[PDB]
Design a protein around this ligand. Structure first.
Ligand SMILES: C[n+]1cn([C@@H]2O[C@H](COP(=O)(O)OP(=O)(O)OP(=O)(O)O)[C@@H](O)[C@H]2O)c2nc(N)[nH]c(=O)c21
Length: 75
């Protein structure tokens, strides 16, 4: 939630495309939801892992090491 960012994007494509094409196109992402606009366009919402935030968060589970952002290091 803080570990993944939610995005909505706009996609234009050929009329011949189906749901599966958009799922394939965005397969690098999580929680993909298509909101069709018309024959050749859709909004797509998705979740993108935030690898830096995840590395920081995961460090809390280890006593031996801690990762923090430069901002947290300051504050
Ligand atoms: C499923 N689908 C929907 N559209 C466009 O979106 C309009 C309404 O889409 P719809 O009534 O077929 O599904 P809806 O979006 O309501 O619900 P969903 O299937 O659960 O997402 C259609 O009139 C088309 O213009 C689509 N357009 C293309 N090109 N390919 C598709 O597979 C497709």
């Amino acid at each position: 939630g803080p570990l993944g960012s939610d995005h909505v994007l706009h996609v234009t494509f050929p009329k011949e495309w189906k749901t599966s094409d958009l799922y394939q196109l965005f397969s690098a992402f999580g929680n993909i939801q298509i909101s069709w606009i018309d024959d050749t366009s859709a909004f797509v919402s998705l979740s993108q892992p935030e690898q830096v935030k995840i590395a920081v968060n995961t460090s809390k589970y280890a006593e031996s090491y801690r990762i923090q952002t430069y901002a947290e290091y300051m504050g």
